[PDB]
Amino acid sequence: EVQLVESGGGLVQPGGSLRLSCAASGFTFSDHYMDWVRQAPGKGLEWVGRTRNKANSYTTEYAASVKGRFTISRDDSKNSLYLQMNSLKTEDTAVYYCARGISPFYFDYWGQGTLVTVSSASTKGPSVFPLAPSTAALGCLVKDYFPEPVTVSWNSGALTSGVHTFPAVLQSSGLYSLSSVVTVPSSSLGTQTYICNVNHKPSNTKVDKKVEPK
Amino acid sequence: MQLVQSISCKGSFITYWIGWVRQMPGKGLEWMGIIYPGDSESPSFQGQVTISADKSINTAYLQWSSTAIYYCAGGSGISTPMDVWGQGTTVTPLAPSSGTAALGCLVKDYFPEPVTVSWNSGALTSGVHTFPAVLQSSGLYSLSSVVTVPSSSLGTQTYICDKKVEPKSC
Amino acid sequence: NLCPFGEVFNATRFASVYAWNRKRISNCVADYSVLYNSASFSTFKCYGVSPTKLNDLCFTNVYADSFVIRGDEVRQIAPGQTGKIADYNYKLPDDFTGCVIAWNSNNLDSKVGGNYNYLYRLFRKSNLKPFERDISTEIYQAGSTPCNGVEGFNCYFPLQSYGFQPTNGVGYQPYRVVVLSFELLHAPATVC
Amino acid sequence: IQMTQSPSSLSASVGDRVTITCRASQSIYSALNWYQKLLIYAASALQSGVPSRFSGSGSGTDFTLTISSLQPEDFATYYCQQTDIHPYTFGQGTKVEIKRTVAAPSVFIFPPSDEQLASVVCLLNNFYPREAKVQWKVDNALQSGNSQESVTEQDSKDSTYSLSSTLTLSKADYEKHKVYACEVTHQGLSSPVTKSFNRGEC
Amino acid sequence: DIQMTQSPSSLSASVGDRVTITCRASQYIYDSLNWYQQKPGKAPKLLIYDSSYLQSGVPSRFSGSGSGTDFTLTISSLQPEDFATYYCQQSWDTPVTFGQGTKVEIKRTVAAPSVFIFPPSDEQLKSGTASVVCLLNNFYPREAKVQWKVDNALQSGNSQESVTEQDSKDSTYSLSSTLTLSKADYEKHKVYACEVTHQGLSSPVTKSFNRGEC
Ligand SMILES: *[C@@H]1O[C@H](CO[C@@H]2O[C@@H](C)[C@@H](O)[C@@H](O)[C@@H]2O)[C@@H](O[C@@H]2O[C@H](CO)[C@@H](O)[C@H](O)[C@H]2NC(C)=O)[C@H](O)[C@H]1NC(C)=O
Ligand SMILES: [Cl-]
């Protein structure tokens, strides 16, 4: 298929440099225009910059927010696009999508994006507590992790019906917390086995926790 | 410009060539032959038919001495081929099971096909499927037309396709 | 002097696409504000550069290409298009640097009776090279029988005409196009 | 010259890109028409009043046909031809049909009237795809020749098909058995579905 | 730079209704204006480019009109799978600016929230904090009030609430209120209760436990 996959995102200190890569499959990378577009969490779409296609050299435009500190670059051999960010700010925190157009006037395909988090704060894995059932709701508390993100599955991917994973909240401390909850039929609690699967890649923390009635 | 067919083809810039398109049942386009009216001049139809013309009436003809539609095509321009044609010349009691049942009318042993029907004097058309006629082992054909109706209507309303179709209801 | 964009845009007469006009704008100062500050235009797409910055940029030569085409043909006047118009009439280079400006021409180029004074090349035995023009009226042969310049079966006159009655849907309606192209040749820039 | 044209079978929803290819018995350069009405002539040229959705590319003994976003009205079968030399023999044919989710068929068996006595008719209503086999079984005995099925043009409303078996028997042969089964083999059912009646019952 | 103002920012729509979002521009951008839909935590998808052209694969209930400075997207018969932010985007000039977005929410019939409270895990307690989770599951509309009451007094400033995104099954929300406090402080009070207010509920619902008692 058409595939754009971004990489390099993670935790970086104010004033430190990071560089992200956009790896492009299923089309003539040289032919297409490729741009970076960012989105700080719960805000709108912000254009970072452009590289034109091989026919137009590979000529570049930047948004003023990143001009002078960010650099867009191309490697046609490796079929990948690059953003080199240097004197980073808290405001550079965002998801970085790369977008390609076969025309310079719109973006057909977009990547899933790489999350860059720009804080002084420091990495810590979560702790995982069970929310035992007294339909019957049960869940997991994922407490005190930085930075975003964390993923939660039920019974090693199996269980997806009536499951809610709440957006993380930021404590005064600078850690994140969320719960995931499942609405289950009353009778199934005795026979069906309930386990939440919590993965925090940034700290390299994986936890599988069994939830049973007290 | 247009061409109006009857077995002849006439029409009216007036076309400088007139050929012949025949259509056997469930078949693709078949070219008959050519005769340019001014000049008045297929190796598989050659001596199966005779292809004549009359320039005076702007008429081209397809004649026999020995089953399909006959389409004559000409040109509005010397450049453009196969542009406009003619309209063509054509020369040739089930009862519901005892919340949706189905009932119909079997029309059988008929020639020459075609069979056209309607339901309750054209008043009922919601569920109706009238199948194409078939030529059977006999060389004749058998055609059936049906309709789904609310099981509620069964045993209340009557149906006339003219054949009086109702439950046998022993 | 003040730079003769009026002539090109406000011209009574427009060339046919196959016979497209080209004008060399030179030893002038070019306002350009006059373009992007207009509502007449349906399309104002710039590939090299930026419409708003053109007045703060300087260039060796600029050319204005004028013609008329159908509404649904304007998207062919762009880098990287295939189609009758891009193939056999007007082709932009892959590395095109300039602005395609077009606008609906129903008022002028559509006759109540019908205007057929506008032609396009229907057939050619190879695609045009970028910024190539071709006025040939040589009979095009797609038949086994070679025409001796005598049109007939598979012997089409290559140019064809637009139906421009004014109640044609906007796709089929006439639009005037002006393609501005900016060349940075080795020589001194004579138009900013 | 003798024409090819492939395929006879195409299933697609509205708006889909469509590609069809018609082969040439001897090189006619580009003297190829495309019909639905004349659509495309001389390989790529468009007949006035035909939408620009349609496009064709071909030369010598090889050609194609393209539709950008299938409109509802474009559903039909298209035939090429040669304008090279007489006679102007047309192509085989090619037909395009709307893609809708697998629909299992409703099977109904109408028994024969005193009037006819013997014609016993089977019904498969409102189904997709077109493919469905209708076996007749009179007292476990499979019938061949005596049967005659006939299908609808794709329904104007819900674009489903409907099929009309019609098994034909001598009255005495009819009276010889009790069973009148209609086993239906179709994508819409997991395994074959039988509809049956018994003479002199209700 | 060219500013683009969408109208309206937020918009509520019944299934099958005919919704219209308008993008307006600080200057003439002729027909250079694209529309994207962004479903939460997923890359935007291109609906429409160059005012009026619908992308291959996009459903045809999506439509672009507009010219000069005023454009509008149209969902005729807005169906399921349509909760997203809708973004207009101009390509006329660099920089490549976007509109602020418009959040479209689906209308629905009132649905009262099922309420569950969960005492802290014994596990978490031995770490030395207690988190009391309160879950308001599958309700509409979003608006809801969650008051914590500890030993029968209003508790303030030890509680974070989180809302899930609208669920494309049934167009309902889930909410969490989490009272987090020192184990010491947790053991100074006996009665923890969660008091819930909503359109759906005839009177406020309270769920509670006495610390220690199952
Ligand atoms: C090309 O013409 C536009 C339109 O010109 C005006 O209307 C014509 C009928 C004729 O009466 C002209 O004299 C008019 O100028 C020009 O844009 C206009 O410029 C005038 C200043 O001369 C200004 O008053 C108008 O507001 C402008 N726009 C309008 C009326 O729409 C343009 O200058 C001409 N030359 C080009 C394209 O550069
Ligand atoms: Cl609703």
Can you summarize this structure?
The complex is a heteropentamer of chains A (214), B (170), C (192), D (202) and E (214). Chain B is mainly beta.
Could you walk me through the main structural features you see in this protein, from its secondary elements to its overall organization?
The complex is a heteropentamer of chains A (214), B (170), C (192), D (202) and E (214). Chain A is mainly β and 214 residues long. Chain A contains no helices and 19 strands. In chain A, the strands form four sheets. In chain A, strands 2, 4, 5, 6, 9, 10 and 11 form a seven-stranded mixed beta sheet that branches. In chain A, strands 12, 13, 15, 16 and 17 form a five-stranded antiparallel beta sheet that branches. Chain A has a four-stranded antiparallel beta sheet with strand order 1-3-8-7, with no helix packed on it. In chain A, strand 18 and strand 19 form a beta hairpin. The termini of chain A are far apart. The radius of gyration of chain B is 24 Å and the shape is elongated. By secondary structure, chain C is mainly β. Chain C has two domains: 1-113 and 166-192, no CATH class; 114-165, no CATH class. In chain C, the strands form three sheets. A five-stranded antiparallel beta sheet of chain C has the order 1-3-9-4-2. Chain C is globular. Chain D contains one helix and 18 strands. Chain D has 202 residues and is mostly beta strands. The longest helix of chain D is centred in the last third of the chain and has 4 residues, at 171-174. The interface between A and E is large, with 44 and 48 residues. A molecule of 3 linked components (NAG-NAG-FUC) binds at residues 5-6, 9-10, 34 of chain C. It is classed as viral protein/immune system. Keywords: covid19, SARS-CoV2, antibody, antiviral protein, VIRAL PROTEIN-Immune System complex. The assembly is pentameric. Potent SARS-CoV-2 binding and neutralization through maturation of iconic SARS-CoV-1antibodies.
